[PDB]
Each structure stands twice: as C-alpha cells, then as structure tokens.
Design a binder for this molecule. Structure first.
Ligand SMILES: CC(=O)N[C@H]1[C@@H](Oc2ccc([N+](=O)[O-])cc2)O[C@H](CO)[C@H](O)[C@@H]1O
Length: 898
C-alpha cells in the first residue's frame, strides 16, 4: 500500500499526488468525464505502457493525451477540504480521503458517487489490484470475448490471452470493463489480469493486472453508448467493414492437398461434379495413394478440386459469397511456382476470376506478412504489399499461429496490415481483417472470430450467443465465427440453426477442410440448403439496414446488442435471462434456438424468450404474429425453418434486392420495410462500400421518418424520406423508392409529394401491375418478407402490407413525403390485454421447482413468465417466490399469494 496522501498539486499538464511512501501518481484530465490515473513506482510517467516486444509499436490509445487538449485540465481545480483532497471540474468531483488514500468519483450531473475504492491499491505478488465498492444493482460488462459470457456480476473473468476458443475461455481479451453504475475503465497495460466482480463477497469488485504499475483511464457516462464512445475515442473507433465483409466467406486451402478417388461411404468421402467420391489427403498422408493435386485456378486437370470450382458451386447453389480465402491451411500457400512472384501471379489470376464473379479475395496468415528482403522474396515468404497491389487481395485473417502471443503482438500486426491495405491501394481498399487474441484498440483495425470449436452440436450455438453479446459490449462490434464450426458437423438441425441466427450477426466464415463434412451452406440435404440460402438471402436483402447499424457501431452501440443496451430500465435485460438473445441493431430481437429440446413433430421448444417493455409490441418477422412485451415466454414452438426473430414495432428496416454480393445490389433503388408505431426514425448510411474515403466524409445518409398511429391503432401515417446528404465515388443520385408498410387494411388514401411537387399515385389492381409499374400503391395480403423462406419452409408466410413505389428521382435534390390516411396495422397481441377480467414436492430437482394450481403467467424472483399452456409450470437454471395469475380471452387475474 502506498500510504496516506500528503499532497495533490496542479502541475503544468496534470495533477501530482504524493503518497506518504513517497510514491507518486499523475491524474491527467482528458475531458470533463475522462481522466487517466497513473501511479508509476518508477517515476518515469511515460505516455505509453511497455509492450511485450519493442517492435510492437501499435498503441492501446488512438488519441494521444495531448490530442484531448488542455481545456478540461485548465478547468479542474484541486482543493484541500480537511480530511480529503478534491479534484473538481464541471463533470466530476474526484475525492481522495487523505489518511486511507481511497478515491471516489462523484458524477456531478447525477450527484452520485459512481466509483468508490473500499481498500487501497494493493501491489503485492507483482500485481496491481484495485478494490471497489459493488452495489446490489451494479452490473458489469466487458473483458473482450469472454467465451460463453456477457454479464459478469458475481463472477470473475480472466483478462488473459487464453488461446481457449470454447466456453469458459477467452478468445480475445480486453482490459476494458464497465459498470452500469456509469463508469468504464481501460487498464493501460499489456499485462494479463483478472476482474472479480464480487464472486464470493458481493459488495466488493477487485481488478488485478500483473505488474508493478497502476495506469487506468476512468470514464464516466450516463449511457452505454456514451461509455462505448469514450472507449472508442480513446482506443479507436471500430473499422467499418466493407460491404462484402458482411457476406459469408469461404475459407480453405486449395494449393496443397490431394483428392483420392474412394468408395462412396469411405470415411471423409465427398462427392464431386464428375459423380465420383474423393477423400482429401495432406501430401504427407498420401502414402502409396495417388490423387489429384488441388490448385487455386484448376488449371492442372483438377478443376473440380480448385478454389475456382468452390466459387462456381456457391454460384450454382445461388448462395451469397462475399469473399474467399484460398490459402487457409497450415503451410498451404497460394501458388505452386518456384517464386513468390510466380505465386502472386497465380493468386492474381484467382483474384481476377473471383472478382469477375463478384467475390473478393482475402488471405489467411500463420506468419509475418513481409519478406525478409521485400526486394528479393523467397518462395513461401509472404508479401502482403504485393498480395494487395499485384494480386488484388482485400482481406486478411490472422491465425493464432501468427498472433498467439497475444497482447501487443496482434495489435501491431493488424495495425501494420491495415496500413498496407490502405497505402498500396491509395485508400481504394479499406481494411477487412478478422483476428483474435486482441486487446484494447483492436476494433479500430480488425474484427474477431471466436476460434476453433466443434459444430454439429447444440453447445456450438449455446455458448456463442453470449460470446457475441459480450464481445460487442467490449467495444468490438465486428464479431463472427465459423458457420457450424471448424470441427464436427453431421447435425442438420444445428447447421440450419447456426445459419439462421448468424444471418443477424456481422461475420460468417465457412471454415472448410477440418470438419465431419464440407463447410458450406449446401453441405446437407436440399431442405437444409434451401433454408440456409433463405437466411443468407435475407441478410443480403438487409444490407442497407446492416450497413447502417454498422455505421452506428463506428461511434455508438454495437450491432449485436445485449438486451440491457436497448432496455436499460429492466433488470431481466442485464442477467443470464438475457444470455441467449440480443437486439440486432435497434429493430430486431433475435432469440436463437440453442438446444435440441423438441416435440414429436420436430418443433424446437424455446424457453426464456424475454420480450422487453410491457408497452411494446413485438412482431414475429416471418409470420407477423404479435406479442406483448414485459414477459418471458417458455415452451415456444419453433419449427426447423424458423428462428425466433421479433421486430420492435415502430421499426424502419432499409432493404435491397436479394443479392449474392454487393455488386448485385441495385444502387438505383431504395426500399424500406416499415412497421409503423407512433413516431420512429432511421438513418440509412451508404458509401462506396470499399475504400477509406468514408473517413474523409465521402458517404451519404438518408433520414427516414415514420409518423403514424401506435401499434394496432388507426390513424394518419406520414413517411418522410429527407434528401440524401453527402456524396462519394459512383454515388447514384437517381433512384426509385419502395415502401413496404405492414398494414392490416387497405388505406383510405395514399398521396406522394416529391421535393414539394405532388406525384399522382394509382392503386395497382393486382401484384403484377404493381411490380410492372411505378407511382403506384398496392395493399397486398400475400406480401412475403422472404420468398426464399416461404419456398424453403413450405409455408406461404404471407403478411399484409401496403406497398408504395415512386419513379426514379434525384435523392439529393428531392425528398419523399408519403401520406396514408386510414393507416392501420392491427393484429391480436399475445398478452396484449393485462386487464383484470403449491410447490409440487415430488418434482423438485436440484435446480428446478415445479409449481401447480387459454394460458397462465408466473412471477419468478420478480420476472413475469407467460405462454404456460397447461395447469403447472417448472422453473430451472437455478443454482424463490412464485405468484400465479390466469390468462383468458378478456384479460388476466391479480397476483395470487406469494
Ligand atoms: C484459432 C485459429 O487460428 N484457428 C485456425 C487454425 O486452426 C486449427 C484447427 C485445428 C488444429 N488442430 O487440429 O490441432 C489446429 C489449428 O488454422 C486453421 C487453418 O486452416 C483455420 O484457419 C482456423 O481458423
């Protein structure tokens, strides 16, 4: 312990705290809610922590202390207030008890103590530990990719480069956590740590990092978006993926292995287009067998075994494919020549072919990306500069084999790679890097994938959902994983369920070559293939929405959102009651199927669907079925074709034509799927999709406003598309406009103003007239959000919509105002009417209680459960008070005895 504080002095650039031990700390005030506290036993007070190697020059911070300016520091006063020293600016009171040295921070806007040390910093055992008060309602997020976990109260998390990709490991640590009390802390260290959020003593949180230094950035903010924006201003805004990065990729090696003709039914046999069965061999496993060597371009009497042939199969199977890594395999390489330049020419010809097919090429790496002598490369070296400038590579994946050391290593590597992409293309290619073993800052260059796990089993989904959520809460919105795992497979239902929910996630990797079957969306039967295509096409149609929430995640909430981000006033949104669902942007609640529980009809039984907000209607995206929030639904029947996705009524979802890659998007069209519910709004972002020019303001935004009746009510609806602001290379100014307004009745009238001039709309007599014509509207009871899913599910999945089409117009010069009179979107709402119209001892397990007494509701520890279809209900996931009420046609009853 450094002892009592004897003095706090305002120096030229920071406040100097002198402890009775003679140890000093510097407080740097960066803005009115962010400060750095640096207790440096060495007295050097260097701006940056020591990395694990001096060549690791990429910094945690993206903004220097000097870049924040001196204003907040100038406007912070130190006062000697008897038993305390106080630092005070417009934002914070930082209060230090003189005798104990304990720091506490009053947020002056809240007039509440947000952070309070309860024991002094401890430097024992070559670690630096802070001990904080933990309050009963205080929750904690962050830590990076905390495999299986997102909400950390009552647990400890390891801030360690664990190189463990399965539940309970850490695929990508981050020394960043935040408290729902309204603070975030970045430990300014490259050293591993352990954050114990009151795992045995619930009133104490301890944060420990190895080392002899205590250096931390403390930021105070009253919103989760503000905490993340603080983290991003400090450590770097997330990179915005190029549009193609949101599309599934195919990853494997096509330069190294051999295919041997085998019998059908041979272990590992794969059928090819010649109608024969082949089994894949590494060259060293061939033994006396003879096979056909793979190549990227299939130029060697081997076309069906080539990387080109895989592009052709995704095309033949009409599957989206954004990008392709053809060298993803240990020692695989990307050419078979005697030179790097010969291999780069082979890869360039692959990239020409991939690009002719609308697919970008990335490379995997297990190594440094530069030759020992770039002017004289050796065969088998890497030269990301030539790979980029000569071969046209646009993306990079960093194997643990490269970045496995962790901490400063990965950040240095991905920073250097990002700079090469940009420099070699003069900014024509923005970075597209997928990494792991990250740290604070990684997000500004790279997204993460979660590493190697076994698919073909429900645990593959179950642990991934919270993993994504917690990754995103850690300031990494660009998260992905392998589609149905790198290992295993042979479980059709898991495969379909994985493609389903990852539609509503950023990055999808078909990590092929290691599994129980090929890793593609067409590896299973036609039922699975058509479902996977349907969900992949839905993602392609959602690209304007997805790109818009991606833009938001550059300086705001991430794309995968913990329930608490969108519903901060509900306790359920913070706990493991929210571990298996999330908001995909603001507008979609995704509650993936994550276990094999079923009925005899093969329907999955989904428990614990938490629908927030007693005042909010949630709309099944596929069927239009409506559900009242403020409840957790158990026993929800979910057919194989379906993933539980609910639209937040009010949602504007920008859409586009189904497409297999960004070059197939019609840039001369725009389309909005709207669920009007009072006054809502959406900001649609666009840019050139590929370059760094967005960072220099080459982008455009379009504000869409929907102003109509509340859910299920009738009224006037005004949809206003404000003029598009901004421009960029190959910006298309002249676009047609579609609105698909979910509606339950034909309107009284639909009128259209374009830049203040009326456009006469005709009522289409039928769908074919509507589809053929422009300046029309059409009330359609056969509206399909996803025709591929309708066809794949064997369900029509018809919904009712009022669709409106306007002719091409200048989107910059002229707005759109559509007025619908007699607008209504009414359906029956499950739990819509909350109007007031024993413990079964023999069934008590260790962790499940069964209560007995058109449906019922039960309150479990202050959380309301619904969809209880019979005369009993069991509650589990226990290591409790039960009230029950009846549900009928005309409302409910009041709470029975606790
Ligand atoms: C975490 C990581 O880098 N994963 C890579 C890596 O994966 C494996 C997979 C299996 C083993 N093993 O059986 O011991 C080791 C490493 O390299 C793969 C190369 O194809 C993939 O890139 C995978 O994502």
């Amino acid at each position: 312990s450094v002892g009592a504080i004897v003095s706090i002095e305002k120096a030229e650039k920071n406040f100097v705290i002198t402890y009775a031990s003679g140890k000093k700390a510097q407080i740097s005030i960066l803005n009115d809610h962010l400060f750095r506290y640096h207790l440096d036993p060495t007295g050097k007070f260097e701006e940056y922590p020591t990395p694990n190697d001096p060549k690791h020059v990429a910094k945690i911070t993206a903004k220097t202390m000097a870049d924040y300016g001196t204003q907040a520091f100038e406007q912070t006063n130190v006062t000697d207030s008897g038993n305390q020293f106080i630092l005070e600016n417009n934002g914070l009171k930082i209060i230090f008890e003189k005798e104990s040295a304990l720091m506490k921070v009053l947020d002056k806007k809240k007039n509440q103590v947000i952070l309070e040390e309860t024991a002094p910093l401890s430097f024992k055992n070559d670690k630096a530990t802070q001990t904080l008060k933990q309050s009963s309602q205080e929750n904690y997020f962050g830590g990076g990719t905390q495999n299986g976990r997102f909400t950390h109260k009552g647990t400890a998390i390891q801030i360690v480069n664990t190189n463990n990709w399965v539940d309970g490991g850490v695929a990508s640590p981050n020394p960043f956590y935040w408290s729902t009390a309204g603070y975030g802390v970045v430990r300014n260290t490259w050293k591993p740590g352990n954050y114990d959020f009151g795992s045995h003593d619930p009133q104490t949180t301890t944060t420990t990092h190895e080392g002899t230094d205590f250096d931390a950035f403390y930021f105070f903010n009253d919103s989760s978006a503000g905490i993340l924006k603080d983290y991003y201003e400090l450590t770097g805004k997330p990179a915005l993926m190029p549009e193609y990065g949101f599309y599934e990729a195919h990853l494997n090696a096509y330069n190294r292995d051999y295919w041997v003709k085998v019998a059908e039914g041979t272990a590992g046999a794969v059928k090819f287009e010649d109608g024969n069965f082949y089994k894949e061999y590494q060259p060293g496993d061939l033994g006396n067998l003879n096979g056909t060597l793979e190549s990227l371009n299939g130029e060697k009497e081997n076309y069906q075994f080539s990387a080109r042939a895989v592009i052709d199969r995704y095309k033949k199977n009409d599957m989206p494919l954004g990008w392709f890594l053809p060298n993803d395999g240990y020692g695989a390489g990307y050419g078979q020549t005697d030179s790097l330049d010969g291999d780069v020419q082979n890869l360039k010809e692959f990239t020409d072919y991939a690009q002719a097919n609308g697919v970008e090429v990335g490379l995997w790496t297990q190594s440094n990306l530069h030759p020992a002598d770039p002017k004289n490369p050796k065969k088998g070296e890497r030269d990301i500069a030539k790979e980029v400038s000569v071969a046209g590579v646009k993306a990079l994946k960093t194997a643990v084999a490269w970045v496995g050391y962790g901490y400063s290593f990965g950040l240095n590597g991905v920073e250097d790679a990002a700079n090469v992409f940009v420099k070699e293309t003069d900014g024509a290619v923005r970075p597209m890097i997928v990494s792991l073993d990250g740290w604070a800052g990684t997000q500004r260059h790279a997204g993460i994938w979660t590493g190697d796990q076994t698919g073909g089993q429900w645990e593959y989904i179950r642990f991934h959902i919270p993993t994504y959520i917690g990754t995103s809460l850690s300031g990494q919105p660009n998260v992905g994983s392998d589609m149905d795992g790198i290992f295993g497979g042979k479980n059709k239902e898991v495969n379909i369920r994985d493609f389903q929910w990852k539609t509503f996630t950023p990055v999808q990797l078909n990590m092929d070559g290691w599994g129980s079957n090929p890793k593609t969306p067409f590896a299973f039967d036609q039922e699975a293939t058509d479902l996977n295509r349907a969900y992949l096409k839905l993602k392609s149609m959602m690209m304007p929405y997805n790109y818009s929430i991606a833009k938001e995640s550059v300086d705001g909430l991430p794309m995968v959102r913990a329930m608490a981000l969108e519903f901060p006033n509900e306790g359920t949104a913070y706990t493991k009651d929210s571990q298996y669902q999330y908001m995909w942007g603001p507008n979609l609640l995704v509650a993936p199927i994550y276990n094999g529980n079923q009925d005899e009809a093969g329907n999955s039984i989904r428990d614990g669907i938490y629908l927030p907000d007693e005042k909010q209607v949630w709309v099944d995206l596929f069927t239009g079925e409506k559900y009242q929030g403020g409840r957790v639904l158990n026993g929800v029947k979910t057919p194989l074709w379906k993933v539980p996705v609910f639209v937040k009524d009010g949602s504007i979802i920008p859409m586009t034509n189904p497409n297999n890659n960004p070059k197939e998007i019609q840039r001369d069209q725009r389309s909005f799927l709207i669920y009007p519910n009072g006054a809502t709004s959406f900001n649609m972002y666009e840019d050139d999709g590929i370059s760094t020019s967005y960072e220099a303001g080459q982008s455009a935004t379009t504000k869409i406003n929907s102003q109509g009746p509340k859910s299920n009510e009738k009224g006037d609806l005004t949809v206003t598309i404000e003029p598009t602001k901004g421009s960029y290379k190959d910006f298309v100014d002249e676009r047609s406009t579609t609105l698909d307004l979910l509606a339950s009745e034909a309107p009284e009238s639909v009128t259209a103003m374009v830049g203040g001039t009326e456009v006469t709309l005709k009522q289409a007599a039928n769908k074919e007239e509507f589809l053929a014509g422009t300046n029309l509207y059409y009330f359609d009871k056969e509206f399909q959000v996803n025709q591929y899913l309708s066809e794949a599910s064997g369900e029509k999945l018809n919904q009712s919509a009022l669709s409106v089409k306007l002719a091409k117009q200048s989107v910059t010069a002229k707005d759109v105002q559509i007025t619908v009179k007699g607008f209504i979107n009414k359906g029956t709402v499950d739990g819509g009417n909350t109007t007031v119209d024993a413990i079964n001892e023999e069934k008590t397990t260790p962790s499940s209680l069964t209560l007995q007494w058109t449906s019922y509701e039960v309150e479990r520890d202050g959380t309301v459960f619904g969809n209880i279809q019979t005369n009993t209900a069991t509650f589990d996931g226990f290591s409790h008070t039960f009230r029950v009420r009846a549900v009928g046609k005309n409302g409910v009853s009041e709470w029975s005895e606790p």
